[PDB]
């Protein structure tokens, strides 16, 4: 018969899912940024530019004011409209003569004799064009479009575990187990060798696997515990849908107190553990201790949940069981993000190198 | 006694191997290629070259025909033979005057006054030499030699699971369990506390762990199932070698319906799960439920497979159990491949940057 | 009742820790080095320098001797003191006229007419300044400070498993189980539903989970074995602290014969397996088969270890259980190291590219 501790294996596998919910899934390697370094290179270039170039960014009546493009439209014989926003952003702090003179001294361009200034200008313009071409690589905007946020991932994990965007509180306010469709008895709710369960998410599957009820508390209801049964008082023959207090006494078997540094491999290993504990029969696959007939919670039957989507002839969990598919989506999005962070590293490092060379007065003369 | 579900843990571990066979192990991150970008840079260089350089690649009697090196041997006072193949490939489409004039307009070299053309040529020749030096890095050809194919990996996994290069079909045509050496009784086939098994691969180990036979179907033969025993009809005291129908009723407990994105970590975790379920005794290590004496399939004995290669005094599975060693080889080859893909990324990104600069007419003047 | 094989799951999880101890945790991807390539670039630069520059590194009375900076202090009107150590290291082999003439021929600078030499010098000086700026990136010294050693990691793993810096030998010389605090009886030592254990490390936890004693050898003492019980003879009601022979008969259930290529993911999966097998009760969490009351080793009680640090209301193992926290530290240090190796790759590849260009006589003329 099924007794104390018999479902420890399944509980561990399901809790490895549950623990990733709430706001515990953390995205560490995050937005690798190079825009400040690029902006610094662009502003160095504008500072080094001839004063008649900076003058194009000034209002005709007030030298300290940025040019208005209705007041002074850009010349049509130029590609200036294609670059004006970035140029004007570089020029704005420089419209102040005190800020500009400071930047010239800071970048070591002050006092440079004309020929030496020309050669410094040439190297800076070359390095700036190189910085733009590295920062504007297509696999940069692509990589950028592949990055997600801790937020988006957290919401999708909560969907697979709770069919909700946020984890329900300790009383499970707003939550209704089994999507409101629980009826009749435990085996109708949790499934059998011939019928699928009503559990569409990870939390309700854990409830089928681990909840005691009013008849098994002294026996099979201890499958996931050691000392005492969860004590739900679940009476599915009278009130099929369990209460939030009932659900929380099962959730507290899992670690909802820590955090997990998300990783596609972490998600994979957890999904694989659940998926391969599925016992494939002719009509259903069963997760949990199972002796005979159905997942009624009786010590002679089963403490388990059943799925019709995978069998000994068809189905793969991360594609055909909806809640495991949704969690596989998080792994997929984590992989893309992880590769992007790696790809966005090269421009970042190269732009730092360029900014260092642009501030080396000796190099500016050599590379000219 | 051993009964329904007692081997779910071991089945899950073994099926995590079996599911990687057939053509389900997929290599995602594949050949990172930069040869098209390099070829484009080389053809840009040839187009920009002086017309008397392109003329060296033409037949003396037909300007549209490539030079024949028997008809017109290359000068010995040059390193031209060391570069001719790549140069001739760049020059071939350019031998057509219409294609060449188009490429000149496309690369924005047409109409350039002589001094501006010379400076553009200088920058392109410099960028092309840089592209070659990046593309010809030694850790590029090395990385290239470390890359494998989904095919080679799939064949080695099928060797560890089936001792064959392809997964046997549903009737196991062409396959003979236990390499034709099964004899006497189940315990002679599957091993004991004193003797090793006849199972040399993963599939036959799963058979020892999970097959019912004609005597245990109502008891220990349900160790890996829920509702019904596999129903092999295996009668090893009369016909020791099971049939293909018998083997398939056990294989269908595993997920042969999906695919796995291969990963050294995936392989590691799966090998580690199997290896540490091995129960180390003085003379053998046992995988599977074991109560007494041997792996006979009796409810009082064992549903298991034994190996003499590892014990409580010696042996490590991924080195001393042949089938686990072969699968560790796939992990090793996956690691090399994964690092190579990463190393081949840098040349790829740099060549894209160079091609962008070479097509920027403003940069070609600045960098000269 | 608890019997043969009932703790195989827990043993596998704990042995996955134990196997990482001793000197079996191997750091593969190790120090990515670029200093030899940098030193080669710096020495190429010094060789190409004007002879009057090399002369600054010579003693005034002996041209073959390095300048002494007390004898001939460096000029104050220069930044020479900021670069002298690296310059002098590049110059030292060149003070020998035969070595210098050889290096000039080797780098193909001999016989170069003056204008061609000047242009070669210009390109080499530019490439050398670029090499320095890449090699001196801040995320290089940072990455360098993040790298650890197989040694440091091995010592911290041995702390989590043994509370010692090295793994005890087969007789456990120098080791005292349970930090010398074992007393009274098995349940006082290994814990209960109300009390924590005396086991502060991984080895002593495995002892609580898997050791037989003088009363359970024929029953619960076989929870982690197949054929024969470990045979400790442990008699905690008389001599609470087990002997080294006793401890070794339990350790030999784990694989101490191989090696593991360390990986944060490897550590994570192993920590997660242990952490989620912890059965959370109101006052303790229990690892191991548990039927009633305590971890006394009786077949009706438990073969297990208990922790008060995590419960069904608080605690996360990798932060609140000291030995699991220490092992999580190894994972954290492995992640930093793995990212560093990746970041230190870019300078390495770029310096190889520069050294190749500096040795290409054709490029030295083009890039001038
Ligand atoms: C770092 O800082 C530097 C400055 O130090 C900055 O350089 C500036 O770059 C921009 C963009 O590359 C340059 O913009 C060019 O400006 C010229 C000059 O236009 C003025 O002068 C002419 C008289 O010669 C007037 O007619 C005109 O009204 C302006 O007052 C333009 O002629 C250029 O436009 C032509 O070329 C473009 C291609 O580059 C075409 O897209 C465009 O349609 C124009 O084509 C015309 O001329 C072509 C000549 O080849 C011809 O083929 C076409 O048929 C057509 O007739 C261009 O807009 C600007 O001058 C630079 N400033 C200085 C002081 O050098 C860098 O941009 C900055 N780096 C970064 C990355 O921010
Ligand atoms: C991008 O596109 C450019 C063109 O825009 C292309 O440039 C070509 O590069 C190749 C390889 O670098 C150059 O090949 C050289 O050609 C000269 C010229 O040979 C002709 O003219 C001489 C008369 O001066 C005739 O005697 C001869 O028969 C040819 O008609 C050769 O002299 C060069 O060979 C010498 O130097 C090599 C080292 O670079 C040696 O390996 C070789 O043995 C030769 O050594 C001889 O001269 C040495 C002088 O230093 C001397 O030391 C030796 O003792 C010996 O006497 C070389 O083959 C070619 O000219 C370039 N073309 C143009 C138009 O510039 C790039 O290759 C292309 N980029 C890429 C990456 O594809
Ligand atoms: C690769 O190999 C090359 C050689 O091929 C090597 O180049 C050497 O680089 C160093 C460092 O960049 C150069 O050092 C400079 O040396 C000059 C010359 O000093 C001598 O001559 C003057 C007379 O002109 C004497 O007065 C003096 O006593 C020496 O005999 C120095 O003048 C330079 O110092 C000034 O500039 C530095 C900034 O770069 C300041 O930090 C320093 O305080 C000095 O400032 C003074 O002059 C400034 C002028 O702008 C002025 O603004 C200040 O107020 C102040 O008055 C500097 O030390 C050396 O000359 C190069 N050698 C050659 C032959 O070219 C590369 O270093 C090497 N690459 C690598 C990476 O190893
Ligand atoms: C589960 O199976 C037991 C044993 O046959 C039976 O008593 C229950 O009614 C059933 O749900
Ligand atoms: C396995 O062990 C059982 C129980 O002792 C015995 O009956 C079988 O004959 C043996 O193979
Ligand atoms: C463990 O529990 C058993 C069964 O109740 C009891 O006999 C032992 O004394 C206790 O330690």
Numbering used by the authors:
A (entry chain A), B (entry chain A), C (entry chain A): 24 to 391
Article, verbatim:
Long-term immune evasion by the African trypanosome is achieved through repetitive cycles of surface protein replacement with antigenically distinct versions of the dense Variant Surface Glycoprotein (VSG) coat. The mature VSG proteins are attached to the cell surface by a GPI-anchor, and consist of two main regions: (1) a large, N-terminal domain (NTD) of roughly 300–400 amino acids that is most distal to the membrane and (2) a smaller, membrane-proximal C-terminal domain (CTD) spanning 80–120 amino acids beneath the NTD that harbors the GPI-anchor. Therefore, at the heart of antigenic variation in the African trypanosome are the NTDs of the VSGs. These large subdomains are elongated folds centered on a three-helix bundle scaffold.
